[PDB]
Amino acid sequence: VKPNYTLKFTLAGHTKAVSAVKFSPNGEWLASSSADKLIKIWGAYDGKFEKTISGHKLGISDVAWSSDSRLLVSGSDDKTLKVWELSTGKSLKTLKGHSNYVFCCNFNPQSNLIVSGSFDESVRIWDVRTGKCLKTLPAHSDPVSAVHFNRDGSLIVSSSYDGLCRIWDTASGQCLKTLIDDNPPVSFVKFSPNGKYILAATLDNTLKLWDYSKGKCLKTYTGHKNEKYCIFANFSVTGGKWIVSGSEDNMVYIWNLQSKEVVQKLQGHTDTVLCTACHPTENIIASAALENDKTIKLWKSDT
Amino acid sequence: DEIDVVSP
Amino acid sequence: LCSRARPLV
């Protein structure tokens, strides 16, 4: 059982490193964020440039979609987050309160809340309607690399360069759990679609799939290079069950979720592949890379 | 030993 | 360059 992603489109337009790429939940759009201070929207199936969204003062490190594909949230080195209305390009709110670069962000499923993580070592939960910060969690002792809500919004996972991965009760703000052999920086983390497992990446060229309730590592995936950058990893579940991640050898890696065999390496980028994302219904992968490449690529497979 | 990531 | 595009120190 094995995939065959082939290159279909290359999208260009960013003038600096592309920091994140993300499909709209409705499957129609691809958003990209960049150090060039911009967000760009592309048609998810044809890769056709849709529009540019501007307003951040400095580069953007992450960008994310509301549940209804109408809004987007971004986090910037200008210490703020901004909520965008897709259809109009408006900056509806500007979320202020972090004391250093905002690195990562996400809506909850209900999309009435946003979670953020920052170089200032905190995780914040914001009210989407009022733009006010509801809670500041003193989550880590080093910059916060990723944040993500589980399926029903009850839980938040964070990760940090301090080597910890932590689970938080959304309602109370309490730390319910802390994952722990060495303490290599944790560069990325994300719940599984069903909310039972946690995919985590560490700066020792390793991805691990955790059962977070039992606090035990169930799978480990290697072959890629990852010692420097906070690279996105994904579950691909529309066809075969894969793990998908970028890599510092300019290649997109695809593992079999069960066997942990590398089943495909997508070639064609000319710098570190920092971001990847999986389309929600079709077997379509998006990828994008750093300063020396700056292009976004779309790949499709029959499985 | 196979994990399901979609279903509850 | 935004934070994510800068390597581990």
From Swiss-Prot, chain A:
Name recorded for this polypeptide: Protein will die slowly
GO biological process entries: chromatin remodeling; eye development; haltere development; heart development; positive regulation of proteasomal ubiquitin-dependent protein catabolic process
Highest taxon above the source species: Eukaryota
Chain's role: Contributes to histone modification. May position the N-terminus of histone H3 for efficient trimethylation at 'Lys-4'. In neurons and together with DNA N6-methyl adenine demethylase Tet, plays a role in the maintenance of transcriptional activation for specific sets of genes.
Family of the protein in this entry: Belongs to the WD repeat WDR5/wds family.
Keyword Repeat set for record: yes
Full-protein interval shown: 58 to 361 of 361
Subcellular location: Nucleus
Subunit structure, as described in the record: Core component of several methyltransferase-containing complexes. Component of the SET1 complex, composed at least of the catalytic subunit Set1, wds/WDR5, Wdr82, Rbbp5, ash2, Cfp1/CXXC1, hcf and Dpy-30L1. Interacts with Set1. Component of the MLL3/4 complex composed at least of the catalytic subunit trr, ash2, Rbbp5, Dpy-30L1, wds, hcf, ptip, Pa1, Utx, Lpt and Ncoa6. Component of the Ada2a-containing (ATAC) complex composed of at least Ada2a, Atac1, Hcf, Ada3, Gcn5, Mocs2B, Charac-14, Atac3, Atac2, NC2beta and wds. Interacts with Nup98. Interacts (via WD repeats) with Tet (via C-terminus).
Changes seen on gene knockout: Larval lethal. Conditional RNAi-mediated knockdown in larval wing imaginal disks results in reduced levels of trimethylated 'Lys-4' in histone H3. RNAi-mediated knockdown in neurons, does not affect mushroom bodies alpha lobe development. Simultaneous RNAi-mediated knockdown of wds and Tet results in enhanced mushroom body alpha lobe development defects compared to the single Tet knockdown.
Tissue: Expressed in imaginal disks, larval brain, nurse cells, spermatogonia and spermatocytes.
Organism name: Drosophila melanogaster
Main localization category: nucleus
One function term, GO molecular function aspect: histone binding
Entry keyword set: Nucleus, Repeat, WD repeat
UniProt WD repeat ranges: 5-43, 47-85, 89-127, 131-169, 173-211, 215-256, 260-300
GO cellular component: ATAC complex; MLL1/2 complex; MLL3/4 complex; NSL complex; nucleus; Set1C/COMPASS complex
